[PDB]
Amino acid sequence: PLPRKALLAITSAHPPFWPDGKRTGLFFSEALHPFNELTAAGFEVDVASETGTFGWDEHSLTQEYLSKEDEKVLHSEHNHFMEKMNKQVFKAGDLAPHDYGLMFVCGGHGALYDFPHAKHLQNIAQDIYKRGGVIGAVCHGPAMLPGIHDENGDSVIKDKTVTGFTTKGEIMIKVIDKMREDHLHTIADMAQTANAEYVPPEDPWDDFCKVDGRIVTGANPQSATNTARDTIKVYEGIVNE
């Protein structure tokens, strides 16, 4: 039986990144919204990064990217989400992978730096998938997926339809130059190299999710809630087999 316990995977990278000089990192709403959905569906949640540490993407902490509810959580000390983020983030390699029935992979541009080679997080996900569980991933989160393998050593997304942050969006927000400077690949190029089929939303910020078997992906911060919801729907079907 797949445990009703989720691993919320977060980037450990937070370098200066944006054109105004601000750091990237974990996208705030992309951790909070899935945490809320998982909690509402009765999951226990552990948070982990490859190192055990993280920083928030600085743009994700601005009004442009925070709802009224988001900001209240951010500035609240006693809140269960913030207590977990402040005091309970694990180094991924310490955790026993068999404890989880689902992984949810958060985004933020930091994910481009560490997720492709985040072998401890990838090991947890491979184990979940092998036991028949579910992996959801939003925005830049899908950068982890090429390194999560099936029994044959192929990516779990081989021949699957996936979405994720558009190359159009990287150009529009003017981070494509920095990505090339740091030798980062776009989500679409990572998906193609893994032999997946990348599908962008009609416009770069549309709520847009793809479900293909037990791999669920979302395109951007506006897709996070529904990516988590779709991931939970897939899980519920498996445990009711």
Active site residues: 139-140, 170
Distance in angstroms (rounded) separating the CA atoms of residues 10 and 6: 13
Q: Quick one: which of 93, 168, 185, 205 contacts Cl ion (CB under 5 A)?
A: 168
Q: How many residues bind Cl ion (CB under 5 A)?
A: 5
167 binds Cl ion (CB under 5 A): yes
136 bridge partner residues: 104, 216
Closer to Cl ion by Cβ: residue 131 or 178: 178
34 binds Cl ion (CB under 5 A): no
Closer to Cl ion by Cβ: residue 149 or 179: 179
Distance in angstroms (rounded) separating the CA atoms of residues 229 and 241: 19
Three-state DSSP state, 41: coil
Q: How far is the CB of 66 from Cl ion (least distance, A)?
A: 22
Footprint of Cl ion on residues 2-31 (CB under 5 A)? 16
Residue 157: what are its φ and ψ, rounded to 5°? Answer: -90, 5
200 binds Cl ion (CB under 5 A): yes
Cβ atoms of 59 and 65 closer than 8 Å: yes
Closer to Cl ion by Cβ: residue 9 or 234: 9
Quick one: which of 165, 185, 156 has its CA closest to 227? 165
Residues engaged in binding Cl ion (CB under 5 A): 16, 166-168, 200
